[PDB]
């Protein structure tokens, strides 16, 4: 069998799989009081992309299509195209277009457009509320709130580049975004379909290990924590390698390459998430040059050394 | 050193701990995709009541106090008293008054009242929407919708007796109640406090075992499934016995007394919930005289025989 492995990359060398920003740190905490079912950053260890996951980190939380002005307002409806500008097909066996945001919140960015006949261009501040009834990316429809009521042409290529998140600042700080609440991809009162499954630790004393970033904040007092289950580079690497899983669990050691010292060990479950032996909320303290090393296939009953 | 046990009672001889109706059956299913954090039917095996749990089966989802008419409506605000008509104290270390509903839904029942001076009485159809901003039992205020704007008197003892649940038949069938969504006990935009913890299986191949009833439906197409973690009789029994836990897990066998044969075994975790070894949704088929029997103290690493 082709040997399994994970990339030789430090945490800071890698990228969040749920928003186009670098990873910052490792975090673990209990999760029984919320549902951990992100759709980006989902990949089996033998390289099957799940949920809404696609390969490039720069397409995460972007949208492409043409826009229609909602007269009387500064709002525009975008009819979604595929990343390569091809027609988008709502009947594919996915929850939503690949790269669609997988949390409820207010994502701020910039809508840009080029007019093809003369090469004229324009960019405007834009916000997408993924909790809105007009957020229906699975059916190809997303509404943006912008700072213009006139600049954007119809039937011209238009792109949303995400920047960060905002919070209604007259409200209790850090109550949005809600990173563990999936959007309703087809709008109100419509069940999501074809989801990657929710994940949870399934061994005594274990917690999920999260790959954490801080999203930029553009207004108010947002909760900028963003946790993904797999670095985007691991998604990319498993897809490329396609090494078959020999058991349910790949045992990884986090090692300091200067000293060879193992700092902690963790379980990489073959369906694509990581657990550690710890109880409580904890920001891991790691050497900046540390990296993950696959050591052995184990079963689900392996007892990790406490971290 | 007092020996632990569970009562010798069949499933149909016991009572749901989350609504005043008998238990009907046993059910198991995966639970990573929702939060299992009920506040009624919560009790440790050594008899410590948790959440909003109290001992009386008939006080579950009941409210008592005086009512104030909401001028212009057929609605009344009940100013809550304790279940024994004493003053209610919002500063106790509980999430809400004991027996408060622990799910978001529309509970229909009857508001009754007696006039102290002459013994005149009155009763009216009433509904409490536990997802309402005006559902704030932690602060002693609960709004009822009734069919009168003038019959109830001020400063007179008033009781809500629950009957069942309703759904808006003009909307998708079985979309409410939501038995795994806690109310906001202090109203809009206010965090719940002092909750009994969420629960989850913590061993490979295990699922929660649920004690299931069917709530009466009073209108529309409600989801009447109601799952509790412990029968109300087990809450009552553990409270009375107060037997100390000798380990984290009491191993129970479900035995058929007609044959003496064990049908399945399960783990009763000392913090007060049950797991079984099974994968998938399953309605347990059990003999009518079967009951649970405590056999030995084990730990969270014990491998159960497949259910």
């Amino acid at each position, epitope marked *: 069998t082709k040997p399994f492995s994970v990339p030789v990359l430090t945490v800071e060398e890698m990228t969040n799989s749920r928003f186009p920003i670098p990873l910052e740190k490792l975090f673990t905490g209990p999760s029984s009081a919320f549902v951990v079912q992100p759709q980006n950053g989902r990949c089996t260890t033998d390289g099957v992309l799940l949920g809404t996951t696609q390969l490039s980190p720069v397409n995460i939380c972007t949208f492409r299509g043409d826009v229609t002005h909602i007269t009387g307002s500064r709002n525009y409806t975008m009819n979604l195209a595929s990343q390569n500008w091809n027609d988008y097909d709502p*009947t594919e066996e996915i929850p939503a277009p690949l790269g669609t945001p997988d949390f409820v919140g207010k994502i701020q960015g910039v809508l840009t457009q080029t007019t093809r006949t003369d090469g004229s261009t324009r960019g405007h501040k834009a916000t997408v509320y993924t909790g809105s009834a007009d957020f229906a990316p699975k059916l*190809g*429809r997303v509404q943006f709130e912008t700072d213009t009521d006139r600049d954007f042409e119809a039937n011209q290529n238009t792109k949303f580049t995400p920047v960060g998140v905002i919070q209604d600042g007259g409200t209790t700080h850090r109550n949005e975004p809600q990173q563990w609440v999936l959007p309703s991809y087809s709008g*109100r009162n419509t069940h999501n*379909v074809h989801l990657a499954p929710a994940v949870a630790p399934t061994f005594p004393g274990e917690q999920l290990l999260f790959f954490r970033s801080t999203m930029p904040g553009c207004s108010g007092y947002p909760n900028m924590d963003l946790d993904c289950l797999l670095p985007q580079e691991w998604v990319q690497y498993f897809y490329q390698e396609a090494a078959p899983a020999q058991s349910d669990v790949a045992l990884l050691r986090f090692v300091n390459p200067d000293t060879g010292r193992v700092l902690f060990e963790c379980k990489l479950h073959k369906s694509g998430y990581v657990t550690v032996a710890h109880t409580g909320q904890h920001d891991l303290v790691i050497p900046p040059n540390g990296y993950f090393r696959f050591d052995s296939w184990v079963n689900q009953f392996y007892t990790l050394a406490p971290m | 050193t007092k020996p632990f046990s569970v009562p010798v009672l069949t499933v149909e001889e016991m009572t749901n701990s989350r609504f005043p109706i008998p238990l009907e059956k046993l059910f198991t299913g995966p639970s990573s995709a929702f939060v299992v954090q009920p506040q009624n039917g919560r009790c440790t095996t050594d008899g410590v009541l948790l959440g909003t749990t109290q001992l009386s089966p008939v006080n579950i989802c009941t409210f008592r106090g005086d009512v104030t008419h909401i001028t212009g409506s057929r609605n009344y605000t009940m100013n809550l008293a304790s279940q024994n008509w004493n003053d209610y104290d919002p500063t106790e270390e509980i999430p809400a008054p004991l027996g408060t509903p622990d799910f978001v839904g529309k509970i229909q029942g009857v508001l009754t009242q007696t006039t102290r001076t002459d013994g005149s009485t009155r009763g009216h159809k009433a509904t409490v929407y536990t997802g309402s901003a005006d559902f704030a039992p932690k602060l002693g205020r609960v709004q009822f919708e009734t069919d009168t704007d003038r019959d109830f008197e001020a400063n007179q003892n008033t009781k809500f007796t629950p009957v069942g649940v309703i759904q808006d038949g003009g909307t*998708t069938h079985r979309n409410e109640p939501q038995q795994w969504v806690l109310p906001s006990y202090s109203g809009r935009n206010t965090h719940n406090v002092h909750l009994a913890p969420a629960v989850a299986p913590t061993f490979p191949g295990e699922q929660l075992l649920f004690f299931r009833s069917t709530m009466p439906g009073c209108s529309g197409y409600p989801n009447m499934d109601l799952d509790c973690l412990l029968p109300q009789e087990w809450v009552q029994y553990f409270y009375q016995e107060a037997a100390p836990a000798q380990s984290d897990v009491a191993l129970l066998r479900f035995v058929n007394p007609d044959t003496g044969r064990v049908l399945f075994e399960c783990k009763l975790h000392k913090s007060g919930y049950v797991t079984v070894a099974h994968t998938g949704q399953h309605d347990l088929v059990i003999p009518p005289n079967g009951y649970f029997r405590f056999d030995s103290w084990v730990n969270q690493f014990y491998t159960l025989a497949p259910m």
Partner: nanobody
Amino acid sequence: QVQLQESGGGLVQPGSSLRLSCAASGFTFGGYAMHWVRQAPGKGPEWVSSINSGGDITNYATSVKGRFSISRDNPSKTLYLQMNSLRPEDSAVYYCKTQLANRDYRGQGTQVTVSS
């Protein structure tokens, strides 16, 4: 079991209008997005139209936008496609399809020929 049954196809002149129906059973219908897809002779199936549970979100293939209208009646669990200004290239078998959890379901279809 989930069941979908289309109806209303036939042979019609270019420029005319035609309404297709799809009767659904075996699931709540409400709560689920529904779609129309079509398969022309010698080609694979292609998306035509989509609608969410309440009907407040709809979308259409570029080739039928402005001419087709999708709608639904959830109490009777019926999906509809109103087709106007029909063209020869609209000729195809039309299917209703849905997705529930991680499985897709499609009806047997109804034939529509647009020809003089």
